[PDB]
Amino acid sequence: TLEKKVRKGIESLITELKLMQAVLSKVSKVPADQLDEGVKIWAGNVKELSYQMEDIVDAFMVRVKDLHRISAALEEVVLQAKQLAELRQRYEVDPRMM
Amino acid sequence: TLEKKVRKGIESLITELKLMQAVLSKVSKVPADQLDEGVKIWAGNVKELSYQMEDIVDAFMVRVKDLHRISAALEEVVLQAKQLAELRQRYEVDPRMMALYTDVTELVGIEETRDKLINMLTEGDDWSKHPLKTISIVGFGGLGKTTLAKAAYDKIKVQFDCGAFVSVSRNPEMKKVLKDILYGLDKVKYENIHNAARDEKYLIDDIIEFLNDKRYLIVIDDIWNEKAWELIKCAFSKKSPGSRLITTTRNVSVSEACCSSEDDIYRMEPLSNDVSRTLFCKRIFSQEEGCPQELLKVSEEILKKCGGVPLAIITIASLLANKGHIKAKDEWYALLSSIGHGLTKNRSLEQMKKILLFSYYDLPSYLKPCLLYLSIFPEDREIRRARLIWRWISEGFVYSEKQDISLYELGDSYFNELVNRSMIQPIGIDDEGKVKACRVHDMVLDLICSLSSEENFVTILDDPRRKMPNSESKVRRLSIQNSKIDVDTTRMEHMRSVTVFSDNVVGKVLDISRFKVLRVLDLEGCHVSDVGYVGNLLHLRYLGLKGTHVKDLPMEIGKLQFLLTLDLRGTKIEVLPWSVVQLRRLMCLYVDYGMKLPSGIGNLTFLEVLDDLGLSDVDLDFVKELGRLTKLRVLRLDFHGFDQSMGKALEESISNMYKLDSLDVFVNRGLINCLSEHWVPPPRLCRLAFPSKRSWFKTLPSWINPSSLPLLSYLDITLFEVRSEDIQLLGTLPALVYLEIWNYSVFEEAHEVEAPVLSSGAALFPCATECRFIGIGAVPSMFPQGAAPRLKRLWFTFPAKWISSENIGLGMRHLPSLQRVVVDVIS
Amino acid sequence: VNFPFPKKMITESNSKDIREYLASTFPFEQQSTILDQLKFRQENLAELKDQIILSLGNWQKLLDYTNKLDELSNTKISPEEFIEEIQKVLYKVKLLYSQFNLSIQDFALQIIHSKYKSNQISQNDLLKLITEDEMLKILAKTKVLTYKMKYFDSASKMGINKYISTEMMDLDWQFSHYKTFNDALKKNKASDSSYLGWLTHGYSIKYGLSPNNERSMFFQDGAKYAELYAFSKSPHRKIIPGEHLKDLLAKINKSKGIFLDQNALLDKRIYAFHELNTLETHFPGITSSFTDDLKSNYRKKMESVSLTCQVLQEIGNIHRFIESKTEYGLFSIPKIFSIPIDYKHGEKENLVSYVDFLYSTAHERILQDNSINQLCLDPLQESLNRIKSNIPV
Numbered sequence A: 001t002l003e004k005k006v007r008k009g010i011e012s013l014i015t016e017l018k019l020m021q022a023v024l025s026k027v028s029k030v031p032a033d034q035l036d037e038g039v040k041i042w043a044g045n046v047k048e049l050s051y052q053m054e055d056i057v058d059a060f061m062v063r064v065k066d067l068h069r070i071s072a073a074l075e076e077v078v079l080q081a082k083q084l085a086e087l088r089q090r091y092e093v094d095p096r097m098m
Numbered sequence B: 001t002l003e004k005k006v007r008k009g010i011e012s013l014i015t016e017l018k019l020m021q022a023v024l025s026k027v028s029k030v031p032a033d034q035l036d037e038g039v040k041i042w043a044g045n046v047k048e049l050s051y052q053m054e055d056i057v058d059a060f061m062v063r064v065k066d067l068h069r070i071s072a073a074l075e076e077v078v079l080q081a082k083q084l085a086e087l088r089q090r091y092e093v094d095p096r097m098m099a100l101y102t103d104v105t106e107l108v109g110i111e112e113t114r115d116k117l118i119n120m121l122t123e124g125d126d127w128s129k130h131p132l133k134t135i136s137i138v139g140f141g142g143l144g145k146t147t148l149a150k151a152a153y154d155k156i157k158v159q160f161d162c163g164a165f166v167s168v169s170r171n172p173e174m175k176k177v178l179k180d181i182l183y184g185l186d187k188v189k190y191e192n193i194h195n196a197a198r199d200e201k202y203l204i205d206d207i208i209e210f211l212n213d214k215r216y217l218i219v220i221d222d223i224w225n226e227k228a229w230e231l232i233k234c235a236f237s238k239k240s241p242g243s244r245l246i247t248t249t250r251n252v253s254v255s256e257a258c259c260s261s262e263d264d265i266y267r268m269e270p271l272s273n274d275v276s277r278t279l280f281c282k283r284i285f286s287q288e289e290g291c292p293q294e295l296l297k298v299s300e301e302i303l304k305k306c307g308g309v310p311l312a313i314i315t316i317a318s319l320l321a322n323k324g325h326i327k328a329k330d331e332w333y334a335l336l337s338s339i340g341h342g343l344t345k346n347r348s349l350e351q352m353k354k355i356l357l358f359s360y361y362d363l364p365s366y367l368k369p370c371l372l373y374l375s376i377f378p379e380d381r382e383i384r385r386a387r388l389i390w391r392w393i394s395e396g397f398v399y400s401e402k403q404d405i406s407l408y409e410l411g412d413s414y415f416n417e418l419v420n421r422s423m424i425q426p427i428g429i430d431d432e433g434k435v436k437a438c439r440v441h442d443m444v445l446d447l448i449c450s451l452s453s454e455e456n457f458v459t460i461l462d463d464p465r466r467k468m469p470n471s472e473s474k475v476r477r478l479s480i481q482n483s484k485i486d487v488d489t490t491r492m493e494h495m496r497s498v499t500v501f502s503d504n505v506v507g508k509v510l511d512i513s514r515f516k517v518l519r520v521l522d523l524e525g526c527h528v529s530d531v532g533y534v535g536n537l538l539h540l541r542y543l544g545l546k547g548t549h550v551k552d553l554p555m556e557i558g559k560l561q562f563l564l565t566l567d568l569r570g571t572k573i574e575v576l577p578w579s580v581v582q583l584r585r586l587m588c589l590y591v592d593y594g595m596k597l598p599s600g601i602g603n604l605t606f607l608e609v610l611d612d613l614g615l616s617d618v619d620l621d622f623v624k625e626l627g628r629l630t631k632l633r634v635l636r637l638d639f640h641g642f643d644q645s646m647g648k649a650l651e652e653s654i655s656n657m658y659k660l661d662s663l664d665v666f667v668n669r670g671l672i673n674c675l676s677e678h679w680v681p682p683p684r685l686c687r688l689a690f691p692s693k694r695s696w697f698k699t700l701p702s703w704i705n706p707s708s709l710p711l712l713s714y715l716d717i718t719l720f721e722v723r724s725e726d727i728q729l730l731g732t733l734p735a736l737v738y739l740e741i742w743n744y745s746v747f748e749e750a751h752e753v754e755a756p757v758l759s760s761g762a763a764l765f766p767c768a769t770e771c772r773f774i775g776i777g778a779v780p781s782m783f784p785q786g787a788a789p790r791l792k793r794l795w796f797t798f799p800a801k802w803i804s805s806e807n808i809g810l811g812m813r814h815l816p817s818l819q820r821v822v823v824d825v826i827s
Numbered sequence C: 001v002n003f004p005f006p007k008k009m010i011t012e013s014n015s016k017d018i019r020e021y022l023a024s025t026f027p028f029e030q031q032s033t034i035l036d037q038l039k040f041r042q043e044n045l046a047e048l049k050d051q052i053i054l055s056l057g058n059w060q061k062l063l064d065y066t067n068k069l070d071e072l073s074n075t076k077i078s079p080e081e082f083i084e085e086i087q088k089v090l091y092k093v094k095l096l097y098s099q100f101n102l103s104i105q106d107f108a109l110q111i112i113h114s115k116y117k118s119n120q121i122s123q124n125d126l127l128k129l130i131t132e133d134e135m136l137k138i139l140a141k142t143k144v145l146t147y148k149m150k151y152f153d154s155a156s157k158m159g160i161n162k163y164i165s166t167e168m169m170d171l172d173w174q175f176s177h178y179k180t181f182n183d184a185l186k187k188n189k190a191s192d193s194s195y196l197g198w199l200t201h202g203y204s205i206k207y208g209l210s211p212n213n214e215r216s217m218f219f220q221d222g223a224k225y226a227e228l229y230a231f232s233k234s235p236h237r238k239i240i241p242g243e244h245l246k247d248l249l250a251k252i253n254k255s256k257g258i259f260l261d262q263n264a265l266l267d268k269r270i271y272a273f274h275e276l277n278t279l280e281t282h283f284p285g286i287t288s289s290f291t292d293d294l295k296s297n298y299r300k301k302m303e304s305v306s307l308t309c310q311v312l313q314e315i316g317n318i319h320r321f322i323e324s325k326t327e328y329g330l331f332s333i334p335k336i337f338s339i340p341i342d343y344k345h346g347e348k349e350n351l352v353s354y355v356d357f358l359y360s361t362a363h364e365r366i367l368q369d370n371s372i373n374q375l376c377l378d379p380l381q382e383s384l385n386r387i388k389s390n391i392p393v
């Protein structure tokens, strides 16, 4: 009953974690000179969000009362995810050659 | 009321299905090398939603209580698709070029094959006045096609004036190819030719005007998609004797588009066993082979796997010995176990996997799943192609909108398209006149299994593998194999298909009724007869029970309103239940002659192929009843107890059928009082077999005439007497690729082998590869070699009293490969 | 008993010592041995009507055609009408009732033999009537049914029912009528004899004579016979097999390999041997594996096992003879011509010595091998042990 919604939201968490590490790896290739600072700020924020999501999924997996705690936490972290979403859309030689 | 909203949402689901399939086809074109991981993850999730909504819509179609369930599932999957939508917005050289530069003294067995390629083109260079010809080389994946062309090329260049290699990729740019041809002809005048940007046409005109009064030998390789080569051929359209061309390709449907002659097509075969062994020992082993004497069997078994492909063996040998045989007899076996399921997940081997995936990527859509389906079947075994065709049709992989196609010929065309792309070896000829079974190369089969397992296309339980996925719920295709241990089947509720390979664990551990939705059920070779639950399965399409010890089947088969296959060979059942007319859709019914069919067969209007219909104790209405349903293409009939005017009734009722392609009638030691001499045969017919030998006709059937049934390619006829005009009449027929006649009275009465003659005409046999005459003397001094241009084997009888005669004029080499024959002689 | 091998010697001036007794005694009158009268069946042709009247009350047509059979047996009819009259019942009957049904047919067919052996039937008439396809399957079912009716009961308790061979059946003194039907037909039409043997063996399998859990992949199907006839009329079809023929070769070599083993189960090996041996006997050169036979001694193993079956059959016949002095079978020997219980003086001088040489004959040219020992040596030893503990009693 109650555990069902939590269980079916967890896989959404894993999926979007995979997408977030995809983005983070993509941005991490370019050196910190050709990267515009808006992307830097957004990337840092999504990194923190990813840590939060990983902690939540880990707590669920180690545990199974607390079901309601993690349910609130999950909906809460998804809420920061939604808020961080539209902020991004709201605003947009070789040295050893010598 | 409630039905209207769901009935309205279904086609919205269908529109979304079309859009998703379009984007999935677009994203699967790129190799999984330029595609970013985010798009790929999103694509996988989209694919999962695609399966779920197909299942929902199919459940609606088969079912129409349940409406509530359908509506709830539909709203849920809509919410899932919505939620997946915003995640994506929220978070957002040629490998074979090096081979071309390889040391010449590193190729083993090349010179003899090179000589065969040279003297099939330069034999006319002697008197280099012949019109120019092209020699096409075909093959599969990589087996010496480009190298062989270069060895020949580098050999014969002093005796020409021009020449160049040009390569054409998967998706050529015609101007680039033409500039490459121009550059290689002369590098001085055309030194900066790749900078000139005229068009596709002025530089064709320039290349034509350059090659006037010269013999060159231009060679073009790797030509795919024949429409590309129709441009180059216009560059080569002026008369130029003594000039020649070479073409290499993996498509055998483009080679006949070249050279217009089958003798110029060069099929090339893998290396022999000993040559492959010498190559294998040249790379790993330094100079001797007598040291190990303990891994020799391992090397044998490894070389058997690669077969003959110079590429596979070159790659494996490079992997096996980095520095002085760094591995011995333990990880050799580990490698051997790894191949088949997981070898490619390694290093320095991924080089060749791109060369093999080239062909897989070049496949159009609607054929990627058909090729991926082959991963179901085990490592080394022949796969009957009819099984694949029916499984494909039942799966939903075959579909169209033309209504001029019976949806079976379409599957056959797909199979032939797989064959001509040089990806599956066809072997043997079936009883219907086409390819019997197919076999796939071991390296390619293991490579595609991995590709299929990257998604949830199939799931295989194997003892060497002994591996399971993390999500038991998202399983659609299962292939139980030699494994009989971990047979958990709890959390696979939406299972699309299941098949079991030669296992006695089935049934006692398996529980199939628990699969509420199921599309095909395949049970070749099992020893289980407890089928009493198929009434609960209502989505079923394919039901194979060949050799299953099935003694009886449930009475409620009629409920399976959707059904396309029943294979019941080798079963213990001897009577079909009456509830089979209730079936409305069917295309095949594989039954044995022992079983008795209930009355009412005429209602199975959609039936497409019927096999081994037993006619024993049959009444007139039943015989007439088959004629109303006219969609058959293959029909097999045998009987023991109705040989009366009912025979003529059936013989006339068959002519109602207008779509036959094959026929065969079996009868024991009797005159054929079935076929009447005043009767039109079906317009289309190819096989028309008669496998009985104790039976006979009194005379040659009158309806057999070059005018009607012009597409015959098979007879298997037998007659009591024989005439010298019957053979001539048979010679009037257009195709008749296969020939066989039996003289019944010769083998049954005291009759002398006479010598019939073709008096009229000149050849009467333009194309008959096989000709067989039993009890009939077919003397090969019947006409000069310019009569039957293609005839690989010929059989006849030669009486011994004709040794002294003068009518035995053999000894000359006829046009076809007719130097192998052992004629049955009688004293 | 652990009776040792019966070591003897059969030479000249010893052959006729026992064969002369065998030349005139009740048994061996219509048989043969490896080392190499109208009243008797008239009385049964009269007694065919013993118990029929008892259970007439359904059963009336049995008595009615029993009377007709007895009438035709003694009456003389010209051959062109006798055959039609006797086929009136052969081509009408379909099926405690069935035991009496076959006895009508079994005695009916012996009339043709009785008149043919009396030169009343022309050979040409018999040749013209044997081409009928119906009678081939008819006689095929009658032979096996009659055999399993009577000799199966005695063989089952004897322990030799496991070694009953289909082709090796004409040797029975009661079934002395099939020599003509075999020889005349085979020297007049070789194909038809093979056909009828194939049908007979298929009926034997379907009727439990050699039962199995697996379907017959060589018998009970017209495809098979068509292909075998085509092979028999083409000596170069094994070289280039066609469709429906690769599988036959695969199955035959699986059968041969399964027979060649030693530790797998015995019943399936005997069954496979039965079918395969019938296959060569009726179709020569079907399994000419000239490479494997040389390394396996398979060809000689065929004679070894066939002679084992032969000697075991003769041992069973001797057992059924000695215990009689009704195990001879129903409608085999009438009450008056029966053999009483008292012992006869000629048996002590022609039975123990005869079985002594019989075993020695088979144990003089049989190869010994682990595979053959469980197929030939062990049955021979058990038969010897059982046959040397029952003669004095």
Ligand SMILES: Nc1ncnc2c1ncn2[C@@H]1O[C@H](COP(=O)(O)OP(=O)(O)OP(=O)(O)O)[C@@H](O)[C@H]1O
Binding pocket: B096, B099, B102, B106, B107, B108, B109, B110, B139, B141, B142, B143, B144, B145, B146, B147, B249, B250, B279, B310, B311, B314, B355
């Ligand atoms: N006879 C041979 N001896 C040794 N190596 C060979 C031999 N033939 C081919 N190879 C090597 O095997 C590899 C096969 O490449 P190949 O030139 O056959 O490609 P190909 O036939 O054109 O196939 P594709 O159509 O995939 O390009 C090359 O490295 C080639 O040098």
